[PDB]
Design a protein around this ligand. Structure first.
Ligand code: NA
Length: 329
């Protein structure tokens, strides 16, 4: 019941084919804030290899995986994180993972400047994994650029609206998440619905394996977003919602508890503004009713969003959980 949008025309230059995609993106963004993307051109064989090599990584013993743990990754925000210890019933979003981002070397200007969230990945010693990760990052980054063109066209803007201001050199945050299967809770599930959240930035592009469990809170009710082979799942973040004045939705979502007996793999890619972008409200959009209160409380809780640089807005969300990001020396 989520829209399935073919975005192939966004790689081309046909104004009418691009307009048709933009019209669908606009409707999906206004009404659900979530849609599937097909015709995106990311090779099916690359996606399968990524899933298999990710699976191979998480099947390593924990002592091995900890060789690449985030505690070794520094301010770039990278590496492996293990499962929480056991509770009577763990959270439905109980997981391990691998934090990744753009591969930047020691001579990159942001690395020499010491800017948080820039630097090198920790690459586990799984044959093929490093190259596969970099190729997938490259290919899905291009999908992100094209989707922003469709979003710009949908809003009545020039297709390069975001590229020219904020995403020409975007902040790319990529994660491999693995959710092990859990016992079905005994009695009533205290943990039900836990983990509901919205994303922080512009665009999320999700690859999910065949297990599924993604659930989306649309204005018309909670819906399942099952895996569809050949698709990514796309949703918008808080920054995009707020810079459109609430016209395009940042929609809450969560994952159901995996009790399927097989580990569930989910790979989100966050396509965000440059760290130093100074994001501003988009001009020329219709006013959306009932947003002054929400708009003002969000501004107060996210001062850097419209009064500073995007990276400080994002660090304000995550620095408390990752003290290495603002660590000096
Ligand atoms: Na998320």
């Amino acid at each position: 019941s989520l829209p399935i949008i073919d975005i192939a025309a966004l790689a081309g230059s046909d104004p009418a084919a691009r307009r048709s995609v933009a019209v669908r993106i606009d409707r999906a963004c206004r009404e659900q804030g979530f849609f599937y993307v097909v015709g995106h051109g990311v090779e099916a064989q690359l996606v399968e290899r990524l899933e298999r090599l990710a699976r191979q990584f998480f099947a390593l013993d924990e002592t091995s995986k900890l060789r690449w743990r985030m505690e070794l990754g520094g301010r770039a925000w990278r590496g492996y994180f293990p499962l929480g210890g056991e509770l009577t019933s763990n959270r439905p979003d109980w997981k391990e993972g691998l934090y990744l981002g753009s591969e930047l070397d020691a001579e990159h200007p942001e690395v020499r400047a010491g800017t948080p969230l820039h630097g090198a990945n920790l690459f586990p010693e799984v044959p093929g994994l490093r190259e596969t990760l970099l190729e997938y990052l490259d290919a899905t980054t291009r999908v992100g650029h094209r989707l922003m063109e469709g979003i710009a066209l949908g809003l009545g803007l020039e297709a390069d609206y975001f590229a020219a201001r904020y995403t020409g050199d975007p902040l790319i945050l990529f994660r491999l998440f693995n959710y092990p299967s859990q016992p079905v809770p005994e009695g009533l599930d205290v943990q039900w619905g836990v983990g509901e959240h919205t994303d922080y930035g512009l665009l999320t592009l999700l690859h999910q394996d065949a297990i599924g469990g993604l659930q989306v809170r649309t204005p018309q009710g909670w819906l399942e977003a099952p895996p569809i082979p050949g698709s990514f799942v796309c949703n918008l973040g808080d920054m995009l919602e707020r810079m459109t004045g609430g016209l395009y939705r940042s929609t809450p979502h969560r994952v159901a508890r995996n009790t399927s007996g097989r580990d569930r793999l989910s790979f989100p890619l966050f396509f965000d503004p440059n760290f130093h972008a100074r994001v501003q409200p988009i001009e020329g959009l219709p006013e959306v009713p009932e947003q002054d209160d929400s708009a003002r409380r969000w501004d107060q809780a996210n001062v850097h969003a419209f009064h500073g640089e995007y990276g400080d807005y994002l660090l304000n969300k995550v620095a408390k959980v990752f003290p290495q990001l603002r660590r000096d020396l």
